[model samples]
Target: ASTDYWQNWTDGGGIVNAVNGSGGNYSVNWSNTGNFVVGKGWTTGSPFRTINYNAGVWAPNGNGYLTLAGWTRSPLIQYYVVDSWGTYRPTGTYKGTVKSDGGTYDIYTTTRYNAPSIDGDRTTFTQYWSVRQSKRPTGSNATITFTNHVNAWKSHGMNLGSNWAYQVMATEGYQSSGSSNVTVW
Candidate 1:
């Protein structure tokens, strides 16, 4: 997706610029306070097995994370396979660690009670996480073996639905200042 999907969520004077360039490339920046996510991938279904991304430049003033993020229905699940982060990292109920892409990832699960989701507002859902223990360098050509994590999560009983939505190699930030130029293929 050239001019792919974008999501910016906030409750105040938050400004975000999400640009989709040619050949599954994109750039995103945010000012003030809010949350922003920019990525390029499938919209209604996620069948991508393995993915690679080159972050030409990635800088975050506060909270930033690089992840493969998306949602699924029939079970209403939000999932993340986080590869890197800036500043603070997220935490949840640890569900053990699994190895993939030449590194290990700590698994976790969280429940979003009455929270915003792709389906709309206040849709309580379960979120699964596979946060990498080794953060990729701030800029590089990175590979994420998607199936490894999925099958590992499966082994751990983290069942995901068949129907998917809006899967992407996403960079997300919350109430922070950041800039990124990335290409996904």
Candidate 2:
């Protein structure tokens, strides 16, 4: 039996409109179109496109903001990331816990949030963390960077498994001035 993966579609289709002028936030409008299955792999004709708005430009190719025109599953979701180096590291546990308000959330560890490169499959140690909100001490936003290190590890063959262990500690906030509301995506 086939599960209705696209069952939650609108009557006609969906509209992915821009948001906040940031360029990445896309609002999915349901009243326009209905479900249409988008399978894996690259699209044949005009695989991706973009729209220039007054606020920001939107792209289907995902340079920054990417909008899905119809029923589509994110290729990046739950997929492997590899690099040129001969290292392998699995995208380990995505930890999500209930906050004091019973709101379920996640804050990726330093390892998950950042990637570290290794040499020729050589073993090394690196630090990783999940910080609360506030990029700077003076009340600024945080920037997430994915590096080639983790990619190399995955390409070489370092993966996270049941044998892996982790520990948590309370550290200084991302910014000294703000209370860290660290939630990982």
Candidate 3:
């Protein structure tokens, strides 16, 4: 288990670059923030075959939202769970639906022909899921129960697989140019 703080980029532009975890839990105190994308959570393995089990974010001090985003192999899949104000960029064919738990969310599924993995591996028939909703209360733990994940995918005629390679959870920040304190567990 490990924890990390850094930045990430998509294409030639920067996406969210904040704090992350490999397995171990963490906490963050951000001050004098800037206009940049950032997040806090745990991520493991390479993009070719990775798992993000608990990815989240707390942006009480920024203009950004929170979400869970990552890639998986075997069936070649990508998944995301975002807050109401969160955003997900689709790179191929996709569809959308609604899911209800404690609240409502816009879920998106995408299909890609030849997408590159984190390690630059070309993946085929890649599928993706994006869940959107509002931010959770500060100092409270928000989560997508494992059962919910499986059921949601099943309804979409998809599978989340039985084996996972990695897990992540954290608070992400985007276009943050102020002071915010975020923590991940």
Candidate 4:
């Protein structure tokens, strides 16, 4: 991964980095942030592999999640394969459950009306979530069988679009304070 390939985003308060010279690795530290995400992956979605991640010193005061997240066009959807989270677990309109990657994930959907998205400043997009039933143990390395979750979502009519955007093994926070260092491959 090159510098251009890895990306970082923060809407509140935090510092995010695509780890200087460490391709496909990212880190972040924040206090009382609105929303933040950081990681390394593709600018387009395809040929997604079984992703492995290390959550080094993950401690969140509020809402936070360690996930494989991305965006797609056409329908303009944001998606997440949440393997771990913070004090407040992310939830949505319960869709169904999927047994994958050594764990059971409960799929859910949450529509953000006129919210900030990859499409534009004010874009209405649906957020598809495959939140794990049990969050991964703290400060542990784990693997996510990526395609399994995507396939399962499609079975429930949660089809993704062709126009894909940046996809990464991201650590995200919402109205929270946290510090995490994540590495992906």
Best prediction by lDDT: 1
Give candidate 2 misplaced runs (Cα > 4 Å): 1-22, 28-77, 80-140, 148-185
Q: For model 4, state the Cα shift of residue 150 in Å.
A: 1.3
Candidate 2's displacement at residue 86, Å, is 35
In model 1, the Cα lDDT at residue 53 comes to: 86
Quote model 2's TM-score. Answer: 0.18
- Candidate 3's displacement at residue 77, Å, is 0.9
Residues 1-185, candidate 3, lDDT per residue (tens digit)? 33343334333223333334343443344444433334443454232322233323343444444545554556556565554333323223344455544655555566655555443546564555555445444445554443455466667776664434333343444433332344443
Backbone clashes in candidate 3 total: 27
Regarding TM-score, does 1 or 2 come out ahead?
Answer: 1
Q: Write the per-residue lDDT of candidate 2 for residues 42-149, one digit (tens) a residue.
A: 121111212111112111211111111111122111112111001112123443321211112222322212221212123233332122222122112222222222
lDDT per residue, candidate 1, 1-185, as tens digits? 33255544443437668787787788877776466677876665454456778888788778878888888988899999888888877779998898987888999999998877888867899999999887777566788888888888989999898777777888888878888887776
Q: Between the candidate structures 1 and 4, which one is better when assessed by lDDT?
A: 1
Q: Give candidates' CA RMSD values in order.
A: 2.1, 18.7, 6.6, 2.3
lDDT of 2 at 97: 23
**C-alpha TM-score for every candidate:** 0.90, 0.18, 0.55, 0.89
**Candidate 4 local lDDT, residue 98:** 89
Maximum-TM-score candidate:
1
